[PDB]
Swiss-Prot record:
Cofactor: heme
Function according to Swiss-Prot or TrEMBL: Forms a very stable complex with oxygen. The oxygen dissociation rate is 0.011 sec(-1).
Subunit comment: Monomer.
Protein name: Group 1 truncated hemoglobin GlbN
Alphabetical list of Pfam families matching this protein: Bac_globin
Naturally occurring in which organism (per UniProt): Synechocystis sp. (strain ATCC 27184 / PCC 6803 / Kazusa)
Length: 123
């Protein structure tokens, strides 16, 4: 059972995702990776990342993660600094929203988990 459960329903999830989206949209370190992507799809990405980071790793197979980001790695220069900025942006969002520091630390551990990071980064 999902994200919808752990943050507390539609409105909580919508707040989380909108704030995370808003932060990433304004983050000069990482915005150019979404240059070829419309706002609906960028938002859907932040919803996916957030879903992954709250323990729904379930539907992001590492092989999908590797193919999905391959052109970013090869052509946009995607690397660890960028990955870490996305995770950092999520944690900053959750903290602004009063999520308990114990829970932010739990998502910090999934967001930054090594094996999915190495798949995304095509390492
Ligand atoms: C574990 C971390 C991440 C997960 C779980 C993840 C997940 C995904 C998934 C599922 C897609 C495919 C969407 C589709 O097929 O429509 C995707 C696409 C994408 N990801 Fe990630 N991603 C992660 C990290 C990153 C990072 C660090 C960046 C860049 C800083 C990034 C940039 C993008 C881009 C540019 C796309 C292509 C456009 C889009 O479909 O939104 N992702 N990501």
């Amino acid at each position: 059972s999902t994200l919808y459960e752990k943050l507390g329903g539609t409105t909580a999830v919508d707040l989380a995702v909108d704030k995370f989206y808003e932060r990433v949209l304004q983050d000069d370190r990482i915005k150019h990776f979404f240059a070829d992507v419309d706002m609906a799809k960028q938002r859907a990405h932040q919803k996916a990342f957030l879903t992954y980071a709250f323990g729904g790793t379930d539907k992001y197979d590492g092989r999908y993660m590797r193919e999905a980001h391959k052109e970013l790695v090869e052509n946009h220069g995607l690397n660890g600094e960028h990955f870490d900025a996305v995770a950092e942006d999520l944690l900053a969002t959750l903290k602004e929203m009063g999520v308990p520091e114990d829970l932010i630390a739990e998502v910090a551990a999934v967001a930054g988990a090594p094996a999915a990071k190495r798949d995304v980064l095509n390492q």
